[PDB]
Structures are given as C-alpha cells and as structure tokens.
C-alpha cells in the first residue's frame, strides 16, 4: 500500500570575481526540487531552510516553488532543511541536514545534488492522491 516519491536537494557555490563590501567571497544557492516531470508542490506544504545564525533572518521559508535560498557568504556549514507535507498522519515533515560546502578560489565551482526517496506506507486517501498527483509511484 506504499507510495514512493523523490526529492532532490542540492546547492551551487561559486567564488565571486570580486568579494562584497562585507568580504563575502562566494555566491551560493541551495534548493529542494522534484525530478523532471514531477510537481512536488502537490504534497509539499513548505520548505524551511535554517541558515547559520551569522545570516540575518536565518529561517527562510518557501511556501511555493522554487524552494530555494540564494545568498552570499564566506564559509560553508551544515544547513538543516525541513520539508513539510500536506499530510494529517506521521510523518508530517522530514529534516535533512544538508552539507553546504564551498570550494577554494582557483578551483571549479560546486554544483552538487543529493537524491532522497521518501516511502509513505499506508498513506490516507487524501495524501495518497497528492503523492500520485506529484508523480509518485504506487
């Protein structure tokens, strides 16, 4: 009775040609998306990105796609990402601790993807429908 859906977490990080006035050396972007041909918005209520507390307003909420944060800075960190589901039964959300690493000047930019498969056992009829609308496999 299980439905499987796929998330792709990822980030890009590039050394700026010129640091910001604050001395920020890199531009980076972190995201959650589905695979090609999917629509995770049917089952995802929101994605919450928890930045390092050196960032202002570090709890970044995306209620609609694209589920992403674009920032600048000078060091990588572990970035908790919560994906909240439009589900009334457990699990209500999932947390991923994402390795937002940066590379040195003179090295290629970073462009990584982390693929997660979610397996919903015995979803409710309403959540089963949402998972299938998103592209999930029964």
Ligand X SMILES: CN(C)C(=O)c1ccc(-c2cc(C(=O)N[C@@H]3CCc4ccccc43)no2)cc1O
Residue 99 to residue 8: CA distance in whole angstroms: 14
User: Quick one: which of 1, 17, 22, 64 contacts ligand X (CB under 6 A)?
Assistant: 22
Q: Give Cβ neighbours of residue 100 (< 8 Å, ≥ 6 apart).
A: 11, 13, 28, 30, 76, 77, 78, 79
Please tell me whether residue 101 binds ligand X under the rule CB under 6 A.
Answer: no
Tell me whether residue 19 or residue 135 sits nearer to ligand X (CB atom).
19
Q: Which is nearer to ligand X, 14 or 72 (CB)?
A: 72
What is the phi/psi pair of residue 94, to 5°? -140, 145
Q: Which member of 6, 48, 72, 86 binds ligand X (CB under 6 A)?
A: 72
Q: What is the closest distance, in whole angstroms, from the C-beta atom of residue 49 to ligand X in the complex?
A: 13
How many other C-beta atoms lie within 10 A of the C-beta of residue 51? 19
Q: Which residues bind ligand X (CB under 6 A)?
A: 22, 24, 52, 54-56, 71-75, 77
């Amino acid at each position: 009775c299980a439905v499987q859906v796929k998330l792709e977490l990822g980030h890009r990080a590039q050394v700026r040609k010129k640091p910001t006035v604050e001395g920020f050396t890199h531009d980076w972007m972190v995201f959650v998306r589905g695979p090609e041909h999917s629509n995770i918005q049917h089952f995802v209520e929101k994605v919450v990105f928890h930045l390092h507390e050196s960032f202002p307003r570090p709890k970044r909420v995306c209620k609609d796609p694209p589920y992403k944060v674009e920032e600048s800075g000078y060091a990588g960190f572990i970035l908790p990402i919560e994906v909240y589901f439009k589900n009334k039964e457990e699990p209500r959300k999932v947390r991923f601790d994402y390795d937002l690493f940066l590379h040195l000047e003179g090295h290629p930019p970073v462009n990584h993807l982390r693929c997660e498969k979610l397996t919903f056992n015995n979803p409710t009829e309403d959540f089963r429908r949402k998972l299938l609308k998103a592209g999930g496999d029964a």
